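User: Can you predict the 3D structure for this chain?
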Amino acid sequence: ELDGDQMISHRELWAKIANSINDINEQYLKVYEHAVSSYTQMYQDFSAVLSSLAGWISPGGNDGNSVKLQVNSLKKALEELKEKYKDKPLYPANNTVSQEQANKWLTELGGTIGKVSQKNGGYVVSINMTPIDNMLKSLDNLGGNGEVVLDNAKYQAWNAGFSAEDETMKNNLQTLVQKYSNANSIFDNLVKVLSSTI
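Assistant: Here is the predicted structure, written as structure tokens:
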């Protein structure tokens, strides 16, 4: 409990403030920074897939007309994307942490953006790839094979779902970036409050 009569030298106060500033940088700011970096790289890699997609759709179905979607090519790229990020979590940057630590950061980052997973002994907060999994399931449902011809109606429907999952990832990234900006300002304010004590 609070003890107002506790005394401390100015020199010990300076060192205590320094120790705390370092701890907050290590345990909070640097965690957010790496979370942002990791999600940003994933979405960058997904954006490259988006660019590639232009080469995997073309007019088809004997002129009417329809869209010929190279399903296996898209499916392959999305699978490779998931594979790449399987061992690139939001937190922590290296090794593993306890389930309790992982749960704490899941709650901080949001269960939409991260997913707690066990690596065996310890855990990580992985990038939640539900948007990509949803895309894959939808591609599976188009039936057909390595390639499908979609009339206007079926293409509009598929594209609407695909685009929504893309937008979800963009929304997630914008939210993470804002949380990191907020974290930086909370740190600046803490430094300002603590420096004013002396």
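The first helix runs from residue 10 to 53. The chain has one domain: 1-198.
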